[PDB]
Design a protein around this ligand. Structure first.
Ligand SMILES: COCc1c(C(C)C)nc(C(C)C)c(CC[C@@H](O)C[C@@H](O)CC(=O)O)c1-c1ccc(F)cc1
Ligand SMILES: COCc1c(C(C)C)nc(C(C)C)c(CC[C@@H](O)C[C@@H](O)CC(=O)O)c1-c1ccc(F)cc1
Ligand SMILES: COCc1c(C(C)C)nc(C(C)C)c(CC[C@@H](O)C[C@@H](O)CC(=O)O)c1-c1ccc(F)cc1
Ligand SMILES: COCc1c(C(C)C)nc(C(C)C)c(CC[C@@H](O)C[C@@H](O)CC(=O)O)c1-c1ccc(F)cc1
Ligand SMILES: Nc1ncnc2c1ncn2[C@@H]1O[C@H](COP(=O)(O)OP(=O)(O)O)[C@@H](O)[C@H]1O
Ligand SMILES: Nc1ncnc2c1ncn2[C@@H]1O[C@H](COP(=O)(O)OP(=O)(O)O)[C@@H](O)[C@H]1O
Ligand SMILES: Nc1ncnc2c1ncn2[C@@H]1O[C@H](COP(=O)(O)OP(=O)(O)O)[C@@H](O)[C@H]1O
Ligand SMILES: Nc1ncnc2c1ncn2[C@@H]1O[C@H](COP(=O)(O)OP(=O)(O)O)[C@@H](O)[C@H]1O
Ligand SMILES: Nc1ncnc2c1ncn2[C@@H]1O[C@H](COP(=O)(O)OP(=O)(O)O)[C@@H](O)[C@H]1O
Ligand SMILES: Nc1ncnc2c1ncn2[C@@H]1O[C@H](COP(=O)(O)OP(=O)(O)O)[C@@H](O)[C@H]1O
Lengths: 398, 410, 392, 408
């Protein structure tokens, strides 16, 4: 019984996190971990409203989380339809910020009444940037030159690509800092965000490189040159994951009636807030109003890694006068580094798979690998554009 | 399935759907038409379900038994259910002579485990110490004057003791927690960006600062009638976008944390040496981030910890953008210089224990678990400050663990 | 003694020898023997130059001087005055294009400028045993009493040294302190350093465990790009503006207001954004800043931060066909006394502008006037080059 | 003083009379007169009357200078020249050679401190350097009607075929115009294209601008709807701080290194290896990080770059990006008491042919280094050698100044 397992565990031997190994059932393991934790709290009843029952923990234990004590429910709203590339999407948004889903929905409506939005994927490739060290800068220079010859690259590419069917080493960007050499490996990864896959490829590639340069020390599989989950100019300038651009034209009438403002007022706010304002703040990649809000809500709803909102949110929002009389609104959003996937990680869980299915991009695209992930990136870029339209109209109106 | 003329009373499921499609009523008004909250949701799902390519795609999206009462008109719209995020626990975290059991909402494997290991190394080292260096949420509107000479005049005016006092009075009249601290202004030709900074009790303070800013700008307008208020936010805050200003001047809570890990613990718990950790920290977190052209990203993975705690505690997760700013430093310490000194400095943790998502019960549970839920009666803001310290300490545990693993390499 | 005699004595200068010009001749001969082209030095000038002002103040191991052509652009109609701007450069068409920009402004009724802030900085890095201690020092530095004592100590070092504010930043047990102060008409580097050393010494008396790691911890920030100079300013922060009549844009600049605006937005704002620029939202401020700095005896290496600029353009007037233009430069590091401004030729260029030496009546006014002149000339430079790009 | 309508054959005051009468612009004095120095003397006299103190130009030299090289090439409305003291630091032991480095500056102790740095390196066995990349850039901004079109152009430019045709049109403009990679970036319907190419021993601006013009003209044939907004869209990026130059390089990317024996650090630099390291990490790495620097992880590279640039006829305004540098220091040797130091400079914009290097005095400083003009047999080698020299001198400068800060 629980009372029995509790005193057996209190007898040090087994730690609270070794409950999924002993106890013959997931949910009970959680209940037992909770009771044990409750007694260590200044308020033993604090867990009362934290849910944990009837959740499919089979897919979570040993793949997505440890020392599980329940789950956190995030309200999921829906914005749409989003008319993108001649299709209609109903976008799931997990958030606790009031008016976010509503304002984004309004943005979607303005786009719909404007004939829809168009998007293009400009680049696709997840990255990993390890740091290695040579005895001297002259040696690291030699390695860089070697990696730059067609023969050196081919050897590394072969080693990298042997690790998986989706591992296709695209290019290599190397940077030297004295005797240190940072190597940025880039590769597609089917419909997976590709972090783990690229890591495996990187470890195999660095090993092959160690044979030709035995004096090379592999300091860290990640030397922050990726760059993963930290702001960096490199992701903005060279891209990371999926680089996407979206656009739409909003008829003056729609700007007037749906957005409650004018094209001229929107343009003036965009230039002075999103361009000049971000410039005065010393921003690198943050030339937008609130891309992070949309990226985050969709990421949580679709099982993405929410911490990747850091670089995935990079965006430059542009607005221009358009049309016969210059009263129509041209708008574009360019996002160079959307880190996303429809396979693996949190996308392996059922509730998040439901939101992905809702968009028609769940799991692998069997006939065209990577297409589901690309479609999801396009959807994110389009929804961000709807979000930018709506919030900017509100700011422009006062 | 009764006809529409009869259905105008106060009925059946298929009938509401037929009344919705017929009288063209937007799905978002379902909360004001049906009896429960859960049924408004169920109908919305049913309406939504026909507009899909896979009508059964919502099958596993939970929606039943959720307390929508607190969500409606406050946290979300067009609700079709909720998304469960697994919550793990890392700890105890020995911080400032207390012990914390940190809730972490995540779907990334080994994150909670590695962070837990980091907590253990710290506990064995005698614990961590933290300090709140600054506290003040900001809002940075952009106004325009006819000429740069006029915007310069406004800037100078805002810089006199009398001008500031007038603005501070106007700003502070809007709320009991609104305490205008300072003003940072920047000019770009005829544009003037004004960064208002103020404490806000235990609330993250976005809404309170906006109200204060609107009252202050209105007052400023009385002194300079030719001033045009272009946007209540001119990106000079800066909210949810990377910016050097948050890194250099801070935003929300600026915090520093530190600990010393005995060589023995580095060896046995972290599976490496102090010397290897230091070498990885310098060449990855300092030199690597420098080569990548990073502003404020001199850390290994602060964003992972900040995000997991933010989701579990009802914070605004989109604020992970600036809240994640962190510089992690490591150095040789002790008699033989073999013990590991580690510090994490986070200038812009945007956080709160009142309002927004913290008004929901499940997230209040995670906040209670930390002992920082809601307002602090006897010392306003203390709960939010305590939460920021906890976030900074957990990030440091996360940095310790991940760096040890990278240092041990293979 | 001959020259080959003194040379032989050195093997087996201005201190030993009597003449200044002779000591240079000797050094040139001594150095001549180590080069693989000893004749190369024949075209490097050295005679008829008074090394008196240079020795022990501006340069060492002097082997001559480098002549930089000085051109003149103007008149520059700024704040109801007219300036003839000296520009030392070797880049063809720079002076000419800048002159054209000046003409467009003159025809537009002139330019207006304002100095928004004035204060040179020095940002030393100190260390405490623990982050908790550095936090304590920061808190103390932010109290009115703590600032008062540091200020008293800083200001006691010179008549001009006046401490304005303190910006402190923590990195674990490290504490970076940015001292900002006016400095009369001097660029103020040396003066601020003296003040900083006296202030840190005083701070040490309150916190004996504090280690002064370096008088400069790169938090100033001097001669390296940094967001801190852009956001908080350094030296003189200046804004300049003008309106160019549609006719002038058409006839002098050979383009239209609409084309200029479109180039400014997509080049200076969007382009600089795509490039990941911090403070480089302009076309070529560095060209003007550098040419004037060399001609006026400023420290040319300071072109790094001094060049920070955001150039803005918009439609103005009744029919919205006139060109409104502004340039905002947050960190112009400049001076009219000390350093290279102590030399006669550079003093001539400063006199040409009417800002040489100290402004006895109001210290700092000459330096402020020079900063305004630099900002206005940059604006003329931006107008001209942008017109050329908008046209083709 | 003869009458105006007589003089067309005359004195100084006669030229003045004519100019002030017909409102003939001062820059015309070059074509108007027959000589050069007299055109300068007349411009000064004319200018002197437009000054609040007509005696201003008294100490600004103009006599005995070679204006033939300047006129129509380096400067306009010339009123004289500005003398910048030139000091010498060295020998600089770099790659088994010895260099005597010319430095034009007015900052006291700069040459001296740099000289000390050179001595510490010499006594340490010298420094080694490598050129990692070479390629000047120009980054124009073009516009298409829609983002979908600009994306099509980007994709087209990325094919081996599309590139070849671009490389052709670009290369056909010069002997040295040899186009390497293309880096494109999209911002909605805007497309920024960064052309990168070697340029022999020339810094490369004009050369690459020409290639870019012909490449864009070529691209306009495949895309008639493409509008060339500006030959430079700030994506180069030239003379403005930018992360792109730091990350992708511009001009010459160079790395330099040396090891300084503990004894030398102690006796010449007056400090210890341990103190130097501690200052480097907390000033050049952490300090620059706290300041929000992009590419400024050094103590004073700009000082050395500027002094050498002025002395060698380089474009001094290029000190903005050319100064980018990350200075690194670490414990080395058996006893781990020796000082390892490296400086990495990704974007040194330099040349030994063209611009100010066409003038004699600056050619003297270039000859002093043995890199003047074109390298007949190995094009670009002189410019590369100059970049290595700059990187090595910066390293000497960093060593010396850091030692002084460490000692206190
Ligand atoms: C006037 O309110 C505008 C508004 C709206 C409306 C569309 C309902 N929605 C949101 C939300 C519901 C989308 C936010 C606030 C958005 C916030 O998350 C991000 C924002 O702070 C980023 C920035 O612009 O700097 C703001 C809003 C934005 C900035 C303000 F100062 C005040 C209010
Ligand atoms: C070798 O594995 C190290 C490791 C561990 C271990 C402590 C379990 N946990 C995580 C996780 C579970 C904490 C991550 C990966 C962490 C990832 O989210 C952020 C990381 O990418 C940040 C960065 O350093 O750039 C990595 C890991 C880090 C860098 C790699 F290249 C590969 C794997
Ligand atoms: C078509 O020529 C434009 C022109 C002019 C004209 C005003 C004579 N002058 C200069 C000079 C004489 C001012 C430069 C070249 C200016 C150069 O120094 C800086 C510039 O490169 C900064 C930038 O805009 O990125 C350029 C020019 C600028 C960019 C080109 F691509 C080509 C030519
Ligand atoms: C204590 O003097 C150190 C010293 C020396 C010595 C080699 C004589 N030379 C120079 C000169 C002569 C090389 C400078 C001053 C150097 C200055 O130009 C750049 C410097 O400011 C960059 C930085 O370190 O942030 C400084 C110096 C540097 C920083 C100070 F705070 C004070 C003095
Ligand atoms: N509660 C809500 N849920 C979803 N969308 C909403 C909500 N409120 C407003 N919207 C969006 O905002 C737009 C504006 O609606 P509203 O404020 O009622 O003004 P109007 O009647 O003038 O359109 C709607 O078309 C809808 O897309
Ligand atoms: N079409 C596909 N795209 C991507 N991954 C696929 C596909 N089909 C199968 N897979 C499998 O899924 C893995 C990616 O998921 P995972 O290992 O969780 O890593 P990550 O979440 O870091 O991308 C691949 O290594 C491969 O085994
Ligand atoms: N599943 C897990 N959940 C939580 N913490 C974990 C988990 N696995 C490991 N840890 C952390 O990692 C530390 C290392 O334990 P383990 O991997 O068994 O190695 P060792 O037995 O060599 O110490 C533990 O003290 C704990 O803090
Ligand atoms: N060599 C020069 N020196 C100084 N200013 C010049 C020079 N050439 C042109 N300018 C300036 O540029 C403007 C352009 O004149 P010019 O080159 O003759 O072309 P245009 O008359 O076709 O506009 C003039 O107003 C003048 O101020
Ligand atoms: N009006 C003035 N403004 C500034 N400095 C002045 C003034 N009058 C005299 N001075 C002197 O000139 C010195 C400034 O020159 P210097 O020490 O070389 O420093 P800087 O680096 O600022 O040029 C001051 O210390 C002071 O003795
Ligand atoms: N070896 C060489 N390398 C480069 N340029 C050379 C060489 N030999 C002759 N030249 C000529 O010198 C020019 C370089 O000077 P210039 O056109 O002013 O351009 P820049 O100074 O901007 O590099 C080249 O365009 C070419 O005509």
């Amino acid at each position: 019984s629980d009372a029995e397992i509790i005193q057996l565990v209190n007898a040090k031997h087994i730690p609270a996190y070794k409950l999924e190994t002993l106890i013959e059932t997931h949910e009970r393991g959680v209940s037992i971990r909770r009771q044990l934790l409750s007694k260590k709290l200044s308020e033993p009843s604090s867990l009362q409203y934290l849910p944990y029952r009837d959740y499919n923990y089979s897919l979570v234990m040993g793949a997505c989380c440890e020392n599980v004590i329940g789950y956190m429910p995030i309200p999921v709203g829906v914005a749409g339809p989003l008319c993108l590339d001649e299709k209609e999407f109903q976008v799931p948004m997990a958030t606790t910020e009031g008016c976010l889903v509503a304002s984004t929905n309004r943005g979607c409506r303005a786009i719909g009444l404007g004939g829809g939005a168009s998007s293009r994927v400009l680049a696709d490739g997840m990255t990993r940037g390890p740091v290695v060290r040579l005895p001297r800068a002259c040696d690291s220079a030699e390695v860089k030159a070697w990696l730059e010859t067609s023969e050196g690259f081919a050897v590394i590419k072969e080693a990298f690509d042997s690790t998986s069917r989706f591992a296709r080493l695209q290019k290599l960007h190397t940077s030297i800092a004295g005797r240190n050499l940072y190597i940025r490996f880039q590769s597609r990864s089917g419909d997976a965000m590709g972090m783990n896959m690229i890591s495996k490829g990187t470890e195999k590639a660095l090993s092959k490189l160690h044979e030709y340069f035995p004096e090379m020390q592999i300091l860290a599989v990640s030397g922050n040159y990726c760059t993963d989950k930290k702001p960096a100019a490199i992701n903005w300038i060279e891209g990371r994951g999926k680089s996407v651009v979206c656009e739409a034209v909003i008829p003056a009438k729609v700007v007037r009636e749906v957005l409650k403002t004018t094209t001229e007022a929107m343009i003036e706010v965009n230039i002075n807030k999103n361009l000049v304002g971000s410039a005065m703040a010393g921003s690198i990649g943050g030339y937008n109003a609130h891309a992070a809000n949309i990226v985050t809500a969709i990421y949580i709803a679709c099982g993405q890694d929410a911490a990747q909102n850091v670089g995935s949110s990079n965006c430059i929002t542009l607005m221009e006068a358009s049309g016969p009389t210059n009263e129509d609104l041209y708008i574009s959003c360019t996002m160079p580094s959307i880190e996303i996937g429809t396979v693996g990680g949190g996308t392996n869980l059922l509730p998040q798979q439901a939101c992905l299915q809702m968009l028609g991009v769940q799991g692998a695209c069997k006939d065209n690998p990577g297409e589901n992930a690309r479609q999801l990136a396009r959807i994110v870029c389009g929804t961000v554009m709807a979000g930018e339209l709506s919030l900017m109209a509100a700011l422009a109106a006062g």
